Every structure is written in structure tokens, then in C-alpha cells.
Amino acid sequence: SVFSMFRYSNWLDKLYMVVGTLAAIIHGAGLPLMMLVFGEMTNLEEDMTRYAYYYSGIGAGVLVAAYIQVSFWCLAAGRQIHKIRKQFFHAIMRQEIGWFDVHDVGELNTRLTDDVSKINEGIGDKIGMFFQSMATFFTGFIVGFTRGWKLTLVILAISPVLGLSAAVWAKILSSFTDKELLAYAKAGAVAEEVLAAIRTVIAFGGQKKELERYNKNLEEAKRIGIKKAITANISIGAAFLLIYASYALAFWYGTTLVLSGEYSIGQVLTVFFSVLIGAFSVGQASPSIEAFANARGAAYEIFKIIDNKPSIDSYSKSGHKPDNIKGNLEFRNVHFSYPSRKEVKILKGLNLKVQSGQTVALVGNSGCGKSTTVQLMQRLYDPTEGMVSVDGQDIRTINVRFLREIIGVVSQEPVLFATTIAENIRYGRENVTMDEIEKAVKEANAYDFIMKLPHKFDTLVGERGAQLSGGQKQRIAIARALVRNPKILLLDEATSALDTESEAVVQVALDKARKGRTTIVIAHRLSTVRNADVIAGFDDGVIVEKGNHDELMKEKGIYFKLVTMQTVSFWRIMKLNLTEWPYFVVGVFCAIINGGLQPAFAIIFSKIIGVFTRIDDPETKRQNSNLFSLLFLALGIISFITFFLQGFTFGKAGEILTKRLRYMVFRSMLRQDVSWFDDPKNTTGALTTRLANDAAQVKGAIGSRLAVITQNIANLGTGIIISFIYGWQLTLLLLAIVPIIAIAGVVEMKMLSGQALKDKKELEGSGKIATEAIENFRTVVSLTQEQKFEHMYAQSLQVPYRNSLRKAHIFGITFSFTQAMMYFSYAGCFRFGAYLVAHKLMSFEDVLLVFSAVVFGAMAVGQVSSFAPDYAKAKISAAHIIMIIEKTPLIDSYSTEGLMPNTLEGNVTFGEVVFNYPTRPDIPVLQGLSLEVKKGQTLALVGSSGCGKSTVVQLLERFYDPLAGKVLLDGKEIKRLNVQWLRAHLGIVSQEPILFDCSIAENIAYGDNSRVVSQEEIVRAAKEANIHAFIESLPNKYSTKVGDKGTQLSGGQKQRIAIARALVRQPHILLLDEATSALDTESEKVVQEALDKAREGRTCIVIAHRLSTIQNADLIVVFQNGRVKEHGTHQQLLAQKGIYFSMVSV
Ligand SMILES: [Mg+2]
Ligand SMILES: [Mg+2]
């Protein structure tokens, strides 16, 4: 699957790349020509000045070639970066729901960011650098062939071994990188899944277990990365060992020739200079081939997904969209099973039918397949066998886009995007008028509370619409469905958390327009289906009961059964590596040795020339040449050892540091309080992208790149030391030419710091958008807002794209100018040395040696410029990582200080509780209500929807500390009590709970952390929650893997599972927030009886909008305007004719 990375190369992109290749070739060819100059050098002041002028002229050519090469490659890389991101997100959004179910999804988020950053940020400039180095090696060989025939032939004959070794090591490195990126993606998926359910996790105190689960994937990634580092370092060390062995053999053959005299001393010296330059070119090349191998590895999975052509294309136009669409639908022999569990049969081939305006309600036992019916109708899943048809024409023939456009579906367990309410509604249809929105919301009985809040329609909802109460979220979803003005409404339990009055008004409003809308109302509050045209009774996947309400009651079947039952770190990050300092010590020592031995070739050449011209004894000359060759071979072996040691130690140090940074940042994010998760900046997608970006950037600036930079800086330092020692009044020239380099580097860093900060913020926003789309993928697919999300993602990426092009130009300027200035300095130093020699102030051999050292350093310095952008980005990435890790909220879950009472009676008292959500601090919700619950008393509260019911329990859970007031526990102020202790004792049933993607047994066991859960306990809890029977019923029993966020199991099933989870703790305090949100009255009665049997001894607070689950409540509290308007038992409240009587009667 090679070359796929260029699949999105535009003709302008191709021109960019080829021009860059030519420019890199030209730039590389220039350096060895300097060595060719020595060949001419090997009146003299005239030739010295001639060579100096030639070098000065070549300086501008090198300037232009470098700028062109770098800019073209970076521009192509940016274009590929943007095109690949766009097309990959397109492919992800194209996938049908089946592929979305079978495969893990949380991976895709971090896959995007990590893979793109590791693929294109690896191809772009590094490929150009590799072409430059290969061109330099080839040009060195060519000049050697010009000046010789034997030694150059030997070098060429030894080259293909190095070539084949590079190829094989690149292949293996890419293979390893595939698994490394898979491990990173698994870690990212775990992080995303945990963060989405942050409320539940902090409720059940599961931070440690999630942290360990993340650490597992982190450790796998660490191991794979260390393996890759070893592979790369071994490859490069072997290449250089072969290079030095070839050089030593060439030196021996030159000793053989000198006696023969076939080539002069100057000729062989020039050949050796060219070959040494070629070896250093290969040394510079190796990192680029490593990076390209990483790029291919990262491309593997991305293009695997891209080439995943689905069956239900959500973009093709191969269907019919007839103008006249009468809302008539019918199922026919619809055999269907979910691809998530192929075995289970859920639809036995039922057959329904409705006519335009006829409302066919679906009623039955929980999880009987109603949601499956609407899913199959929406063409999310193609039935195994069946002729599901609308207005005669089969659904399959019709075009999917138009079909879903004309269908409006309420999101059972509603899901709203992290935008403003206006836009949340606007997602219903593209072109929508504010008047239409007002009319729809009025129809939804939502205008009143919307106007109540400041920024009536400008108020923001959080992730998955968690900033609003369940009833408010349902009403907003109702508005979203209505605004589409659909011919086929798919109302799905839209009367779930609403207050009885709210449900009544919504039903009346829906009926007002039901005449022309083909609604399919699914509900369990049977009142909401009393006036339904047709009521469908589901059993075992088939419909038996039918007809209107009177006929259904006469049948005395399932429907009648239920009805009756109702009755800043440039040194801080380096500081953090205190536990690795042996690795840095060994690596820096080896890098210093390599740098010093780099220019040492000049001294070696000087000594060899002296030996060849010192004595007249051919035997002595042969002995000296043999000694020098042996020294070169030993130098090569030692260089192999040192290269591998330094490269490996720095690679392992980078990997370990990055893993520790990832673990620390994730743990810090878990530490942070829920309130911090409220801020729109901190959303799950943002956080996961933040991880995958910051950690990777810090790695990139602390990994083997730092190793190569230390090697190059040591090379430059030892070159300057050699120049100063052997020459004086010359190295001062280069030293005084450094200051422009210093200033240019400062300017480049200053610009790129801001550029990268802006790019990072934009990338965090884009990750937020992508994660919001993918996590709520079902809803967006149902609304066909995929195109809108793609546009949002492209618009968000727009800023990084322009910033990337700008960085391409900036870095091209910096690198090309630095190289050109270095070559001008070399030419000027040569001219000055010639002038001094004519002045009889320096021997020519010394000047030649110093020029050799300076040219070696000029070849070396090619890497610092390449490093500069990496350091620029990593500075800010680190800064943010340190900021996050150092953060500490008002309340710390890990904090073990405070009060930890041995035993709690379980009496909860609240007084003067005044609170407002920090998201909208101005708006008050609690009016200082006073409450008191004794041990073994199932207190309950009811009132108008979204009147702070969930807020009371959330304050009880210390999600937010009260703004003003005092809430105690057994006569002890909650604050004084250790947060973890209470969070363990208390139990929260949540609202529309999100179960994790694990084994159902594992999900239930999650309820009581810090102590293993015996299978007996889990099955007992399931039986108590009236699900153990079903749980055993399904294949694999408890091995079944609930989909991401519990999306696979039906609403009632996950409700019961959450009930069981909260039950496993057997808590002294049991807080239930609409535990019976979606349950058949029979199951509701069973669970209520189970709770009542255990009611005594376990103080309980239950909130629900169904009087049936609260009729026998110990004490019912009526909440109005945040205050306890009416409080009393069922008999007392019924005797009075206040709000409770009105709500019950309706
Ligand atoms: Mg359902
Ligand atoms: Mg609630």
C-alpha cells in the first residue's frame, strides 16, 4: 500500500514536489564541489582568491536551492495535511451504522490527530532532506569518479549493501509503527470513553481503574516505541560501520597505490574528502528514511478506513425522491438481527402498516424491539429479509439522503450538541427562520423556560446537552424534530422525564397537527397513547394486539395488562527527566564523541598527507598507512557502538518521558472537578485531542531529534575548537558571523511561537467538533447533518491550513538564509586565509585543514534549522501540559484529608441551600430550600420539569459545592467529611445513564470499586433489578459487550443495568434520579417492590415524574421556584388540593 500517501497530490502539488526535488538535488550537489575545490588546490594566492570567488558565487545558488526545496516540500506537506484530514473525516462520516457498531469508535478521534501529525509532519520536509542527502552522496561519488576510477568504484560497489539495509530497516520500522499507533489509538479510545462519562465515573469514584486501563495501552505503546528506536539506531549504526570499513579499505588501497603511483597524494586526498562528505550525507539521510517509514505506518490504518466503501452510501444519488410523498409505511416479513450481535434474533418478520395522518403507537414490554423497528425504518440497518416499503415503493430503492430528510425522529435519550439552543434547533433543517423556531418551540411547550433564561436563544448547552435538565433536553429535541416539518414523525418516548402537565400540553400540541403528520408515537406512560389511532402490542418480535384503545382493552391482552397494572519549559521539561539522568549522561557522552570524531577526519587527512610526504622510506610509509587504516577501522567500530548507544538511550528516554507525561496529564484531568468540565473550552473531544497533540509534540522535541541536534551542536563546537586551536584570527571571523544566525533564530522562534499557539487552539476546536460528531454519530446520521459537520470541520481546519502554509514560507526563509550565510562565511574565511597566507601569517596546510573543518560543520548545521519548528511547537505544548498537571480544584477526589466517620446513620439535612450553576452563575435555581431525610425513609421530590430536582442530588454528590447554605450528613457538615468517603457511601442512579463499553458484568461491578465483585453478587443484583433473567437470556450471558456509552442495549435495559450497579454498593444513601425513566409498568412495579422490600435500613431519595413509583413514598416534597411549596405524605397531599393533586389528576 505504498505511495498511497500521495493519492491526494494535486497537479500543483505534483509541481511543488518535483520542483522541490530538483532544488534539493542542486543544493546537495554544491557541498561536495567544495571538496573538488581542494582537488584544484592540491600565484597561489590567485588560485585561492579564484576558489573563494567561486564559493561566494555558489553561496547564492545554495541560498536559492535551499529556499525553493524547503518551501516547496513544506507547501506540499501542508496541502496533503489538509486534504488527508478532510477526506479521512469524509470517509469516517460515510460509514454506515453497522461498521460503526462492529468496530471500536473512540479510537478514530485520536487516530485523526496523532496519525496526521505523525504522517505528514514526517513526510513533508524530511523527504526533501533525504533527497538532499542522497544527492550529496551521489555527487561525492561522481566527483570521486572524476578524480579517480578505483576508489570511487569501490565506494559504489559497497553502497548497495547500505541501500538494501536501509530499505529493510525502513520496512520493519513501518511494521512496528503500525502496532505502536494502534496502541496509541486504543489509549485514546479509552480516554475518550472515560471523559464522555466523566460524571458517572466521578460519581462512582472509578478514577484509579480508568487510569490503570489507560496505562495498559500506554505501556504497550512504550514497548513498541522502544523496539522501533532500537531498530532505527541499529540500522544507522550498521550503515556508518559499513561506511567507515569501506573508508579504511580505501585507505589501504591508497597505500597500495602510492607505491604504484597510479594516483597522486592530492587526488586520493580529494577522493577521501568526497567520500567522507558522502558518508555524512548518509548520516543526515537516515532520520528522514525513519520518518518516512513512520509515515507509511501511520498511512496504513487511515487509508484502510478511507478505502472502506460501504453499502448504504449516505452521499450517492442512485435512488428516487418522488415529489409527492404520502406518509404511508408498512413492514413485510422483516427478519432483522443487529450486526453487533449477529446471533440474536430480534425481529421475527413482523408486519405493520399506517396511512398518512394515522398515528400508530408502539407499546409493549421493555426492549421488545420498537426502537429496532424505527431504526430499520430509517434505513440505518438493512433488514436481513423484508420488504419494508413506504407508499408502495420499497425503502431500498428510494435515496437515503432524501428519505432521512423527510423523516423527523425524536432522539430517545436525547442528545444535543455543544452549541447554542438556536443552533441546536437549527440542526433540524439547514434554512430555518427565527419565526419558525419560535412557532415550533411554542408547539413544544419550551418557549417559556427558554425566555426565562438569559440569552434566551443564545444560551449554550454542554456536551451531549448535559447543561439542561432531562425534560428540557427532551423538549429541545422535540423542537428539533418539529422544525424539520416531517411527513413521517418518529416520536420516541418524548414523554419520558416531562412533568405530567408538560406531557399533557405536548400531547395536545402534537395532536393539534397530527392530522397531516404520520407520527409513530412510542411511549410507556400509557396516557400519552390513549388517543392513538392504532396501538401495537409487541411480543417476541411480532405484533399480536392491534386496533384502537377500546378494541385493545376488549382483547384484554398486553396493553390491557399494563393499563390494569398501572391501576515556558525550555528547562522545566528537561527538569522533569530527573529519573532518567543516566540515559542523558550516556547519550550526551556518545553524541559528544561522535561530534568530535566528525571533524576529526580533517586531522586524519592532515596526518595521512604528512605521512605520505614526510619520509622517503616506502617501508616506513607502508607501516604508517597500515597503522592509520587500523585506526580508522577501530574508529568505525567505536562509532557503531557510540551511535547505537546514544541513539537508543535518547529514544528510550523520549519514549519513557512521553509515557509519563501522558499518564500524568490524564491523571490530572481525572482529578479536575466536574465544574471545570462545564467550561466550553473543556469538552471531551477537546481534551482527547489535547492529550494526543501536546504529548506527541513534546516527544517530537525530546525524542531522537534532540539526539541528532546534540550530535550536530557537538560537531559545530568541535569544529570551532579545531579552527581556534589550529588557526587564530580566522575562527574569529566565523564566530563574529554567528550573531546574525542568533538573531535570525530568535526571530523565527518568536514568530512560530504565536503561530503554533494559534494552530494548537484551532486544532483543539477541530477535535472538539470531530469528537462531538463521532460520539453522537447516531443522531447526526438520523438528522443527515453529516454535510454540515464536514463543513464545520473544514472551516475549523482552515486556520491551521493557512498557518501551515505561512510556516512553510517562514521555515524556508530561515533554513535557506542560514545555509547561505554559512556558505558566505566559508567563502569569506577562505579568502581571508588566502590573504593571510600571502601575508605569510599562516601555512597553507593549516588553512586547508580549517576550511575542511568548517565545511564539515556546515554540512552538520543542516539539522538545527530543521529542529527549530519542533522546539517552537514543543515549548507551548509543554507549557500547557505543565499548566494542566499543576492545576488543582477546590475539591480534590484524591485528597485523603478531611473527616472520615466510621459509621454513618444516614440522615441527610439541607438548610438555606442556595446554588446556581457556574455555567450560568447569574441564573439562580435553588431558593434556600430546607430538607431532612431520616434513616430508612424513602423521601421523594416532584415538581415542574427542570426545577432543580437533579441539582439537589448533584449537590448531595458534591459535584458543585453550594453557593450559600449548609448541607450536612448525619449531623455533620458535608465539607468536613472526606469527599471520597461520601462518594463511596452514596449511590447515584443518574439520569439517562451512560454505561461503559465493557462486559455487562463489568459494568455492574463498576458500582462498588476498591473491592472485587463476585459473579454471585452481580447476578443477585441483576435479579433484584429484574434484568438477571434477560441478562442470562442473551448469548454469552454476561460476556455481552454493551456498546459505547451503553448505546447498544435498549434504554430500559441500560436503565435496569444502572439500577443494578447502584444497588451493588448496598449504600446507606441511595439517590435515584428518574430510575424508571423508560420501563414497562410491570417492570417498574417489580423494581419498586424490590426497593420497598429493602427500603428500610437504606435511606433513599427518589426523583421521578411518575406518581406510581412515588405513591408509597415516605415523604413527597413539591418543588416550585426552587422552594418546598408543598411537603407531605401521599395521603396528606391528596387530602389537600394543591399542585400535587392537579399533577396527579392530569
Ligand atoms: Mg428505545
Ligand atoms: Mg435531571
Side-chain angles (χ1 to χ4, degrees), residues 571 576-577 580-584 586-588 591 593 595-596 599-600 602-603 610 618 634 636:
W571 189 87
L576 175 54
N577 314 318
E580 280 190 344
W581 68 261
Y583 284 106
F584 285 0
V586 58
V588 69
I593 293 166
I603 276 174

Side-chain angles (χ1 to χ4, degrees), residues 172-177 181-191 194-207 209-211 213-215 217-218 221-226 229-230 232-233 236-241 244-245 248-254 256-258 261 266 268 272-273 275 277-280 282-283 285-287 289 291-295 297-300 302-303 305-306 308 310-312 314-315 319-320 322 327 331 333-336 338-341 346-350:
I172 184 175
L173 188 65
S174 170
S175 294
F176 284 23
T177 285
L181 279 171
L182 182 52
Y184 272 161
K186 283 198 179 69
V190 168
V194 166
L195 269 307
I198 180 55
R199 303 226 168 190
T200 296
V201 174
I202 188 172
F204 291 128
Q207 301 90 320
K209 282 186 289 205
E210 304 303 345
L211 188 59
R213 190 164 74 155
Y214 193 40
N215 284 329
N217 309 125
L218 254 60
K222 168 189 290 183
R223 186 176 56 82
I224 300 168
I226 274 178
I230 286 171
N233 297 134
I236 190 174
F240 256 52
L241 178 146
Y244 284 31
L249 172 55
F251 185 80
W252 181 94
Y253 209 70
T256 294
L257 264 71
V258 78
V268 297
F272 287 169
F273 290 133
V275 170
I277 293 296
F280 268 107
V282 171
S286 170
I289 177 61
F292 182 76
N294 269 338
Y300 276 153
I302 308 186
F303 290 145
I305 296 183
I306 289 161
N308 180 292
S311 61
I312 306 170
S314 302
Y315 297 96
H320 299 96
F331 295 114
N333 180 18
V334 298
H335 288 352
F336 172 55
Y338 280 128
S340 175
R341 294 192 288 270
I346 304 167
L347 274 284
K348 312 292 172 52
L350 59 74

Side-chain angles (χ1 to χ4, degrees), residues 468-471 497 946 948-950 953-954 991:
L468 274 44
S469 69
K949 303 176 303 312
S950 306
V953 55
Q954 284 191 353
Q991 185 167 353

